Symmetry: D3
């Protein structure tokens, strides 16, 4: 696993965005061989979306041949509600870049048949073959996407009931009323994420310090589903300073030495 120990969210955003641009440009996507990017929503990826839009406007990347898949979506929230993940993604990223609308894939939280919706989403990933880079955040309780505690480590896309803690955590966006947060979400599974060629998790803030310790020093278990990255051949966690507070001194020391050259953009 690579862990990139940076100091601020701004640096995390810039390292992340640069890593995505380098993978796309090294890949050289065509219409016949698109780069497939998996994407998250939440407070965590904001500095990364800002930095990607900047680099696009500066002529560094084109999303013309990138296909995107998002991680999750709330069940039963109107698509045009400002906090649906559909609105989030348009507002913060899609409106500003040159990705064709036919290249955007998002789960429909208001689908009449949830099983059919989830199944077709998996089929759409499979027609492209694979997701080349899946970017995500981590929940306070260790969830990757909305794969809540006790989600199978071989799970596929399905509906999940959100933990009371996740709803309280997300009430931020619904003007602090937990009763306004949707109770369910459609989410890619842990197995779906492990199938991506590379997974990059952004970890920001002291609220994520126990989840980062579980991911890096804990054992594989379905209560902290972020621990599934121990089983992935190419996982990267990009961290700010408050989130590393629960790690052992020798673990942070190792990653600091490892990554010294690769984090000195400056």
């Amino acid at each position: 696993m690579r862990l990139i120990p940076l100091t601020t969210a701004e640096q995390v955003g810039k390292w992340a965005a640069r890593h995505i641009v380098n993978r796309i440009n090294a890949f050289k996507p065509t219409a016949d061989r698109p780069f497939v990017l998996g994407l998250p929503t939440g407070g965590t990826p904001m500095t990364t979306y800002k930095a990607l839009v900047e680099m696009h406007k500066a002529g560094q990347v084109s999303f013309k041949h990138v296909v995107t898949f998002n991680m999750d979506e709330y069940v039963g929230l109107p698509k045009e509600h400002p906090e649906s993940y559909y609105s989030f993604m348009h507002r913060n990223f899609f409106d500003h870049v040159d990705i064709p609308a036919e290249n955007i894939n998002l789960l429909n939280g208001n689908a009449p048949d949830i099983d059919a919706e989830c199944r077709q989403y998996e089929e759409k990933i499979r027609s492209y073959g694979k997701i080349h880079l899946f970017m995500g955040g981590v929940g306070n309780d260790g969830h990757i996407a909305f794969n809540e505690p006790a989600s199978s480590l071989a799970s596929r896309t399905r509906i999940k009931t959100l933990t009371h803690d996740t709803r309280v955590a997300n009430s931020r966006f619904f003007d602090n009323d937990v009763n306004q947060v949707p109770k369910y979400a459609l989410t890619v599974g842990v197995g779906t994420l492990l199938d991506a060629e590379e997974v990059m998790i952004l970890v920001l803030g002291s609220q994520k310090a126990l989840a980062l310790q579980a991911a890096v020093e804990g054992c594989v278990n379905h209560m902290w589903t972020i621990s599934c990255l121990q089983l992935h051949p190419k996982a990267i966690m990009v961290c700010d300073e408050p989130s590393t507070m629960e790690l052992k001194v020798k673990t942070l020391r190792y990653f600091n030495e490892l990554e010294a050259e690769n984090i000195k953009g400056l």
Copy 2:
């Protein structure tokens, strides 16, 4: 993972039996496409076998196109000894339902060549393709089938030496003399069980409370082989009230909310 928190063994038996009937009836098995059911022995499945026989007699299920495989069998116990798993299964289930004798598969604990016996059992599962539902119990030390502590999580059907604790636990059936309990058993492996499409474990009594906590809140490890269910895409644990005593309040709360509608047969 789904966990069904019920109160009594009677309710567990009824939920389990109903779930098996619903899968068979939804499946609509034919002679050319049988439903394949994996089965356990022990004190745990008794209320489930009682409830399945009742439902069969009431015309709810036919086992005419169901093929069964049992989990394990004692090595060196005469087939007609009342406590062989062969006798257990006939006495408590097979004698009462309409399953063809050619549809019953049981390991032969007195086979002259144990490796050949175990290999042919795996081959017989493979000729059907897969086990659609494997029902099991859990040992006090966390074993699934007789995959004792330190059994590989990728193990296949083989002979295993029983732990002294399992023999003491099973001496119940051999009029409390541990010296009468067989020392070895033939057992499907953890890998064999993980290949089933769905796994349903019944957990009854406070003696199983530490094994349930290991399964649900512990990490994946081969000392409690029940923890392998964290890696299975479709595992269900059906519990009575004494077995949930070692779980965290928030874990039981989550599953209680999740399952409220599905446990109110009433």
Copy 3:
């Protein structure tokens, strides 16, 4: 998992060597179907190499149709430096047996393109199909090969930066100067090792007692990569007495009973 609890390093070497000879002779390798042996270096395998050479000289085994692959090699150490793993393997084993030079495979720590070197090594294993037996040691921190803490459990052959602790541990061989120990090594991955048909780890001395406890009683986690053997269908750990000191009494008791007949060579 099988654990062979012996008393001395000499006995471990003799049990190990005999197990390798029995597998080769049962296999009956030909030029068209060679036996493929994965091998380690370090203080741990010395009594095993001594005992294999003895048995070869006594006419018990021929390595004429055995292909070998070594686990790892230091980056940037001259091939003829007495402590390169290349020199180790020639000095202690290859010089004394009848293995054809074309049958020996070792990583080139001075390759100009490290990625290409690592990729071709994996391709060379794949042209033979599989490694039939991979023998290894375990590091004080639980590493298998140089898959240091936080190495993916699905990793392939790649370059790794050695932990300060491993360098201090290995400074033994570089006349106690840590500054002379190479900082990097080329190593087969955890996924590479899990693909071998059988894995046999030799554990010697009280310095390995915490690594053995992590392997046998701990959970699967990438900080102690030796825990990956819990996921392997055919793993054997051969231990001396000081290394078992951190195990529970009931764990050692079980393995002692299990293995009584198979350890009484005498």
Copy 4:
């Protein structure tokens, strides 16, 4: 230890206030034998102070012969600054009850000699003999008063440097600027607290659930100094419902039935 499992912060305040009134009235304080009460500041005691004020106003308790000692005070904050613990205490409690100024004892966080101040405070407690009841809250990381992680479990009143996390927690009272919270505070030690005749800790909110679990189910250690209550002969924890979420089902079951009658008062 007694743990009183209640649902709401309002119920916790009512229970706690009723217990203080019952102890005072059973004691029958006079000018020669005052009841000595230790008190906290923070969000946690607010519903208790409101309920106590209501009881005093209704004629149920008088504080004319109660002597109070507060746990702590910020160093270098002016007395009349609204967030000094002096201002907190008068605004929220002393301004509304009949306690004489003579009976109020607060640490002077702007004393010329801090060392003299702490020693005199201990002397003051000793002159009355004993604190009969010490009420406190618990920090998110288990600190009781400002005895931060790694404070001695036998410490006395002293100056203490606050953990960065506590400053973040308390920044709410300093318009969310961590730079506004004092870095140092005068505080009673853990030994000072353990000398009290009875200790009642109020635990409210999900943010306190890991500290509650450490206090009830963890071991005694100086990283969660709330664990010191395991060594106290008369300790009470009064809890709302979100703070009990990390306890085991059997722990909360046990306290629920011990206190059933005791909380039915409503």
Copy 5:
């Protein structure tokens, strides 16, 4: 702490009885300076009471100047009910030895004022000065006397509500009906026990193996109150072989060689 690793309950009883006789005879009790012995009930002390009776009958010990205090008694069970600890003690011990009725002290679980009873018991111990040796057993969940999980480690004699699990354990003596076991008992506290000059705990059976591991290798905590013996200057645990199964190999190795000579007596 001393731990005496023996094989059988008969050997434990002989060792323990011999140690009591040696302490009494070395003390040389008289009418003015009695030896004060604290005693348990339950299955565990049976082989010790038998061996002590045999030693008294052979003329090796007299109890004419021994004062005894029992650990506990059921509340609300009539004195002459066969399972009252009063009846247990007379049947199994006092009926066969020469102790005067004056010297026997038992808690009266049917006293008018339970609070008066507990305080008088403590006073009675104080009038003799000190308990010279307190013998006890340990519960499956680590309770020493009836100081159930979460009892203060500084508690005194008081009434206590029994855990449901203890009622299940003791239902053996009430023809296996849990509804027959008293819910409340009078018991010496942990502080009462720690005030004894020497404490000897008898540990028998596999059911006690986790409690033994908590006492020897765990941390001090009030959930396993047997852990309080880590704080006692003269504590002894006398164990049979199944109760040591959860200890580490090195822990039992250490005690085996310290006590080798000391147990060779046979």
Copy 6:
């Protein structure tokens, strides 16, 4: 607890020596009121004894009115054997400073009555009243003095059987033959140490990192008796950089900023 995070053993010795000199000089010892210093042997105190000798020689401290007590001594090693702790102490410290022979107190490991010797030592400490500062090291398994795993946390001076691992550790001083190290030593107990007014433990090297983590972040338990310092009101740990490697990042961050000024002295 205070922890002084330094880099090098030379800095640890300078810090520790300076602290001893400051305490002595602030105390102003005289013939009637001596300063009483407790002292260790072993590799750990070497840079401290060198620095103290340099300070004495420069006229900064006199030991004419310092009384010393050493922690321990080997049983059955002749006094003048070079590795007796008597010889160690004179060679490395007393031969170079002005302490009168009258003021030196060492356990006599060749006394006729070992039991008399230990009790007299305790009496000797009591005649001076109190040890003002006890300096010690910590063993690899957390033993403080020779209070090996499972020594009482309230023990007094006594004879003790050494763990095999401690004999292996100390075999360095006996030309690496374990058979040369004494099996038994006289040692001050944990209670003896906790009675000292201040305790300063020097922690040096990577071999001490797990013991340091147990002392700072673990729970109090008698298997790592260094954990007893959590109960001491004035304990100091002076550490070099490799011994802090197993602590959490936030623990070392906290002590680094508390002691920043305090270690800038250089």
